[model samples]
Target: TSVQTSSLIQSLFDFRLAALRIHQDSTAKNASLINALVSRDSSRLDEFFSSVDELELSNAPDLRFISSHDNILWDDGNASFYGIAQQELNKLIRRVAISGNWHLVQTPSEGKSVHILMRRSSLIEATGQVVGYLYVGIVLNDNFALLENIRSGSNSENLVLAVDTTPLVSTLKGNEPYSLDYVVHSAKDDSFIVGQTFLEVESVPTYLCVYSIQTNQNV
Candidate 1:
């Protein structure tokens, strides 16, 4: 099914789109509160973010979105909670506040280590930019959304790789380091059926999903 290179790339794009949709729906659901939080007009922010809600989407499985009262994540937050980068989110939040750009990244806090899809939304008011930022994170450790899609559609094992192909998330038993250039360079060389889609988590060019039809697992 997933024989062509473009097909594989498209599949990953589809997954990324789905992942981004989570943020879309979340932005829709929290539009008012997000707006207020950004404008600093809502008093409920403290109560709302008192304990970051592990938001659940009916259609998505094993994927949860968590957030902080503010961009601080949490007092006890650990870096590399996503097993990739620590402090990445902190800088990302700051950038979003200034530049007001929406970002998607794989970041994790020490409280829970999972491949999280971190999305920052700069809620807007009609007049101009808002006050604060809303950092919504998606827990992707056991997320089957992408897995099921690739398996059933492409018949390939999927991998969630860091910017450098560090095997951030995988179906394999153990992870071995991988290189981005090597993977992309190797895919076209073999007729094994492989493709990938690159995603910029915070304009830093990291986080991607790759698929390989070569065997039971490939990372």
Candidate 2:
């Protein structure tokens, strides 16, 4: 690979991480506000959610509160979402609840996925006992063309995908002869550079980015 393409890959990785940091920072602040409200009075949990008509003001596409045992108390009220299944929003929330993890990816349906950043905060009582948990998330449904811009700007191929798995979003037409294995092994020719990294999903981590740039290579 040439110097220019190598730097491009590095910058892409850096840019992706920076975007995630912004989401994480805001989500944590959201947790703090909600935590303070519910800590004072448990009844205010529902009261707070009812008054929130626009989550987009904070860029949180998905938000919910659950009991300590992982049952939904209140949410943004989208009965069906595309993160886990067509209508299993509760199931998806539970998975995040039980894990208490900060980041993960979910395949909602065929050929689509969402990157979720979650924050779990304890619900406190007057006696200093923890009651429920607060869950806030930012679902990047490929995040309004971030992935598309990455591919188009470089005239390269990329996917919001995982190792040996299907893509959440991509610019490929699905008819390309380039299998993932082919591309990985093809990098030995020195004209192809592949960059990949992982983020947690279910059992295995999914690839955050799988991109390849052709310097002087041909199929």
Candidate 3:
């Protein structure tokens, strides 16, 4: 029946772990294919990328190969369809490729935010030299499956997934009377029974807040 800071941090770590697990599982399933692609073998590349379109087991909706020179060799082919400007997306992709760090990107055209994870891909069969980079992106829209699962698992009626105090995902439904501002304010105020924590999301600070207004209810 208690929801304290410890509980809050645990929930945040759970959500973060889930996000990282997506990258881990994707890498595990696509290791050999990426190895081949980076080695300049294109025979199975197209077919494998084609399967990614159907929301494969990896759940990596966006993935691409960026050459050592920062040229994009291939992508999941949904960037433009998702209204992400090619130049802007490429710029971000290149930055992450070089740094090999996770990032958060905003696409104003589609009003969507995305989380990206980058990995340096090497051709292990030959010289084991880095041939290119791979970037995996997941849309962080309001109803994103990852966020939804975290909210439900934590039993938080109003969960706020934020970065630097800015709300990214809110469990509150669209028709709810309270705005995101209200939820954020309530979570920040010490007067309210809220669980809050801040942790680094790669290079950025991420905040997770969970609170329930139903005071009489006890677990």
Candidate 4:
């Protein structure tokens, strides 16, 4: 009650959005080259992936290639990827992927979920014919530095993540917490309290990132 609800929420969202932006900047360079190399063509993909892996290791890259044409590629615990293979991907993926535009989607794991940015780029720059897609992501939970940022920025606050009816990551990082399934599959714009809401870039409801909720807050 002491904090202005809207303003507090905005501040929280800003902190998180800043995190997203930083990740984007880090991956932006690799994205174009990665897209140029990896594609539906199996001919060059194997070689390209090898080169990119070397690049990634040398640079300490933040993003990983997770999916292509609905097929699951990487499922690093770091990316918080789960069940995002083939038809499991919703429409927004193709909508943006086909247009050669960058996008955001939520990858839900058992106890948590994270935001991912995906893009489909044309192999040919002159023709601009869109082909396969590529993705890079930022995990929303368990980074100690990110946790501290939330805490210091919001007066002892940590992130509380709710996927529909269930709260996944709470102020309590307790031993027994929901992890088996926290990703929201509803496809509707769900509500959360003032951190910041990260919307799907192509005008669809992919994932919602915002402030905490009232379930644990006492009136």
lDDT of each: 0.45, 0.50, 0.53, 0.43
Which rank order by TM-score, best down to worst?
Answer: 3, 2, 1, 4
Q: Candidate 1: lDDT over CA atoms?
A: 0.45
Off by over 4 Å in 3: 1-31, 34-43, 50-58, 61-65, 98-100, 105-126, 163-166, 174-177, 187-194, 202-204, 207-219
Clashing pairs in 1: 38-131, 78-110, 80-86
Could you tell me the TM-score of candidate 4?
0.44
- Top lDDT hit: 3
Lowest lDDT sum, 10 consecutive residues, model 3, at 210-219
Error of 1 at 209 (Å): 6.2
**TM-scores for every candidate against the unseen true structure:** 0.48, 0.51, 0.67, 0.44
Q: Write the per-residue lDDT of candidate 1 for residues 15-63, one digit (tens) a residue.
A: 6646655654455346565654554533455444433344533333222
lDDT string, candidate 3, 1-219, tens digits: 454643554555456645654554455346566565765756566676666545645344444544445577665566676576666666775565434355555555555455443443332233555555555565554435655665666556556666534676667677655666765666433223455555445536544333343232333
- Give candidate 4 regions above 4 Å deviation: 1-6, 22-63, 66-92, 95-133, 139-148, 157-159, 173-219
Model 2 TM-score, 2 decimals? 0.51
Instruction: Please identify which of the two predictions, 2 or 4, would achieve the higher lDDT against the true structure.
Output: 2
Q: Which stretches of candidate 1 lie over 4 Å from their true place?
A: 1-5, 11-15, 18-88, 95-118, 125-129, 137-148, 157-165, 173-211, 215-219
Alpha carbon lDDT of residue 122, candidate 2?
Answer: 55
lDDT of predicted model 4 = 0.43
User: 1 or 2, which is superior by TM-score?
Assistant: 2
Backbone clash count for every predicted candidate, in the order shown: 3, 1, 0, 12
Task: Flag clash pairs in model 3.
Answer: none
